[PDB]
Symmetry: C5
Subunit: 311 residues, 5 copies
């Protein structure tokens, strides 16, 4: 089987369509997601043309082995997709209507700067390499681009499934390649994060601030240091799941700040004690009294600044 | 091989049946379960009809390649099922009795709102895409829908295996699709949870409440903060296994409340100490004395309110 | 290829044998184990009979494709076994001697009640579905049922590999099925458990009991609470590996009891301090003095009671 | 199909080219990386030459089964690559232009000495075993060696993708083998490491140094020991991911040093207390006062010696 | 294809040879390792003999399907190896030189008694089952037994790759089986263990011994109990990776001893305090003073005893 010949010198247009059946396994660390969808393909191969009257059928059905099928691949996949041809339907003009159900593990980079209030655009890149006999160009049949209403991605709200109609035609290793960008828009379900991660993490930090209403150095050392351990332990408990980003993340900057606050609270506790011990309780008392306002205010200010910078 | 032709303009009825052999690997986080079952199919292909008396045989056996078989798929699977055709049998009227043994990883969303006192309905959706020559419609042979008595799902009580007889017939990408809902009803084995999770978690919280029979600020800081660490450590120890739900969970609400209680207990401890130190031991004593009743009562009340809202 | 025809109306006997080559990957949580073994099959097919005299050969060798072979499957496997036919040999009377080497992941429920002093019976269920032309019944050739001496299962002592000779014949999906129970008896290597799990866990609990020779409330709070954290930390450190059983386990009952003891020790510590502070040191002293005997004795007694109930 | 025959006694040159499409799953512990790329092959087989004039077509397309193709393998792979032949092109002179898309898990050792400021050279070794009829030699077509601009490796900056043009010819199992070294140069994105790992780890150590402005042995024991726990807890929290190197690593040395510092800080704390208790507070005070400078200075210095020693 | 016939009644000798290309994934817990190697096979099949003079060829090349090849399997594999036939060559006498590249996961038990100062012998058992027409016996071509110089196994030094020339011929299920033992000698890279595991673990234990230069019961309880937690935490941090051995390990015995030492240190701390409180400070002081020498000496003595017993 060779590709269909051109009537003049025109390229072959392969009309594509992806219909999302199932969407699952979004791995934040791997920056991968698993997909189960229909891939629809349509091209004209006149060699297959028939007379409905002589054939006594309006549409002819073929096996994948019987006819020529364009070699469509996905660019950003781990391994080649697991596909199962559902139907091949030839109308008398020689128009082929191909359909397969496939599953694939798609590699799409993520932007963690606004985590856990982040939205993402997942890409599925369709590609076709042109042959020596003729050039193959991809196209989008928008009526065949969709997603099942039941499509769920644990932890995300599925916004839209669309395709950038204009293909990216370019040369590679001395041949033409026609690329198609299919986009899945998702936004994270940040609800759980408040009572699950944020609130208990803020309570632990607030406990350390009680050292500002105490003069007992032993009690204060216990408050600061034990809370620091509790903070780390709590972090171990919470599945962050995030990879090592080359840039600074919102949640990342806050976490760093929380570590700084434990350190500053220790300095204060240490300073207050030294002044008291070094017979200057007036200074020690003024520092502690200030800290009571200073700590929450500086925290609240720095968080507003952070939020502003990130959003 | 083409589909059997219609006598009039009627659709082809494919009688289905799933018989559960093995059920395993229910992943609470992935919302997936693995299955090993029989898939029975039945349709009429008059082209295969025979005279039993002339043939000498009451039943003819065929190879999958030899005859036309409808393309049945599962909607909510990760990849296509691993199937092995067990038997194909033809009766004189052209009735085909197909049977295959398959294994598949099924995606079924779970409702964690009542965890660990939750019950679930696991779905296995059967589907068939209609062809150009005729429409294909799914049906349920109830005598062919069952489950092996030995079927076990670690941590769950298997209630029932049934099918919603009425198929969901709908159009998809310009063709008819007939869908069948097979339901596996399971309820969680919540026994272990009491002595394994709940009771030790309540004991740790109760230990923090002893700070209400103490005036030693050092001892009290140690009680509240060390128990908070113990709580987090205990949580790390216990495999919750739950994913990040967009909604609020029963266990989730209680856990949040337990974190609030550790924070309030710190406030009390802090307040009592400040009043004592600021020469007002009468107030400090009344607060501590009240807390002794207030803490268990508010806890018990709040839990009752929550339980009521969730059940 | 069709099944061999009956002389009268008698069923076909398939003589089976399993010889264990390798045994590995016993997963306590999944209740699965991996097996590598030989599967021997023997049955009479008179269509393959030959006169050794006019042929010159004592035995004829065939390819699996060339002759009819019964479709034997395993009931309790995740997916179908990976098999490789080693040999097929026909004796003059038409007796076929089949041999294949297979690997399979077998699902066999476990009884955790006596863990880590538990013994298990692992099941491998052989099955054959009868055909329309003839009924098939399984049998056990005991000379072909064995296990390699080198067979090891990390953490277990392999007791015996046997088969329940009498098959379980029953109806399934309107046809007869003949089932065979092959049993692998194993007992846990509980040695390591004493110096690795039990002993360090008892030492941590014993440290908490030193609070009965102390009057320092601060020191006592530290002893009881810090050991409770150490207990939890130690538990995190030790790989229990056990699933959530619907029933109560021996180890699980002890663990619960240990948690109760930490709680009771706190009550004592709290009570002793309150009495002392509330100017009644005689009662406080009697309680502490009693606890010194009460705690070890009640512990030793309830452990004897538990052990008795479980064994 | 036999190899093309030599005109004289010259070896066959197979012109190779690897074009990186996707790069993912760099496992620092396994020292493996997954790669999805094009493998281009070119060689002359005069048996496949044709007179363009007599033939009518300029390029003859073949199926892999139809013609002889050299058996190219990768040395450092876990299992054989998953390949899909994209195109086979024969020019009139018999110059074969082969192209396949493959995915493979490549084993490449890593140098952890400079972690997390390390750079790595990932190797992909191409190999061909010579046959009895003719010797086969590999070559690099530099115009066919590249990488997709979109190629990303989470946590690394992709520097270059090149090949060592001169193949490594050598004997193996009595025959000649021609090896090609393809090199992927990567450097670690060490940014995150500072605010995420280093800085919080230094803060915890700095908290331990406050014991040098305290005389309370109880407060000091709490500071040193509780920070040591916090350090270990923090380490548990941070995914190092590193394997057990036979050599000393930079990080490994700093981490070791941090453990030594906690031990020395304990000695000091212990010494200071003993002198005080043994009625020599002047020595105790001088030691503590010195430690305040000694600890940061010796730390800062040892780190410069370490940094220099490693870079 | 039938086996080559015997001239008399002699067995067929299959000359084997394994050449290690890649060695990876040594799992201490599973007692498994992954391998990528060449498998060379040689046997004489006179039916394939030819006159080189008339044939014009010195050697003839065959496809696996074309000729008879002995069924060689590995005993201690998880599933059957993934093999790819590299070459089949026949010399004028009918000698067959077979070569395949294979990957397999090998099950080889390990001896942990001397961990981390342990050396291991990894086994790869080659096997052939004899047929009805003739007996098959395995042999070792030593020139074809080797390993790639680049072979690395993270955490181990690869000593040698050899084969026990004399096969193990024995009967199994009424037929002869010829077994070959290929041995890979490896020794653990124990360097890292000292600064990474041993030294920090000894420092934590040494910190607990400072309680022998203190009279503060509160400080002593904190020292002993907090170090015990730190010890457990440190153990959690360090990847032991070891399975539950039926026997006692060296490292295992030391770890147990360290737990005993924390318990004895508590007893001392408790005893010293009780004597002091019960107005007998002279005894309390003598016990503490003795402990200072007793603890390190008994530790040192016992380790010498342990080292001696294990080495
Ligand atoms: Cl693909
Ligand atoms: Cl399916
Ligand atoms: Cl099976
Ligand atoms: Cl390869
Ligand atoms: Cl094998």
């Amino acid at each position: 089987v060779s590709p269909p010949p051109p009537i003049a010198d025109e390229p072959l247009t392969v009309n594509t369509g992806i219909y999302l059946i199932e969407c699952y396994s979004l791995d934040d660390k791997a920056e991968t997601f698993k997909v189960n969808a229909f891939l629809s393909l349509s091209w004209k191969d006149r060699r297959l043309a028939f007379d409905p009257v002589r054939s006594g059928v309006r549409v002819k059905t073929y096996e994948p082995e019987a006819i020529w099928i364009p070699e469509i691949r996905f660019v950003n996949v781990e391994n080649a997709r697991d596909a199962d041809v559902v139907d091949i339907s030839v109308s008398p003009d020689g128009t082929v209507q191909y359909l397969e159900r496939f599953s694939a593990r798609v590699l799409s980079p993520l932007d963690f700067r606004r985590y856990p209030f982040d939205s993402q655009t997942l890409h599925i890149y369709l590609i076709v390499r042109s042959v020596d006999t003729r050039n193959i160009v991809l196209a989008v049949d928008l009526e065949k681009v969709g997603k099942n209403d039941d499509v769920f991605l644990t932890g995300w709200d599925i916004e839209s499934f669309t395709a950038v109609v204009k293909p990216a035609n370019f040369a590679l290793e001395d041949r033409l390649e026609s690329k198609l960008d299919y986009q899945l828009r998702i936004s994270r379900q940040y609800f759980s994060y408040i009572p699950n991660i944020i609130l208990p993490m803020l309570f632990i930090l607030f406990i350390s601030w009680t050292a500002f209403w105490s003069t007992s150095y032993e009690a204060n050392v216990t408050l600061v240091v034990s809370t620091l351990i509790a903070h780390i332990a709590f972090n171990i408990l919470v599945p962050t799941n995030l990879p090592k980003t080359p840039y600074m993340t919102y949640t990342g900057a806050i976490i760093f700040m929380i570590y700084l606050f434990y350190f500053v609270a220790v300095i204060e506790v240490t300073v207050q004690h030294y002044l008291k011990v070094e017979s200057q309780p007036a200074r020690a008392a003024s520092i502690t009294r200030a800290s009571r306002i200073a700590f929450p205010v500086v925290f609240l200010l720095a968080n507003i600044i952070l939020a502003f910078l990130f959003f």
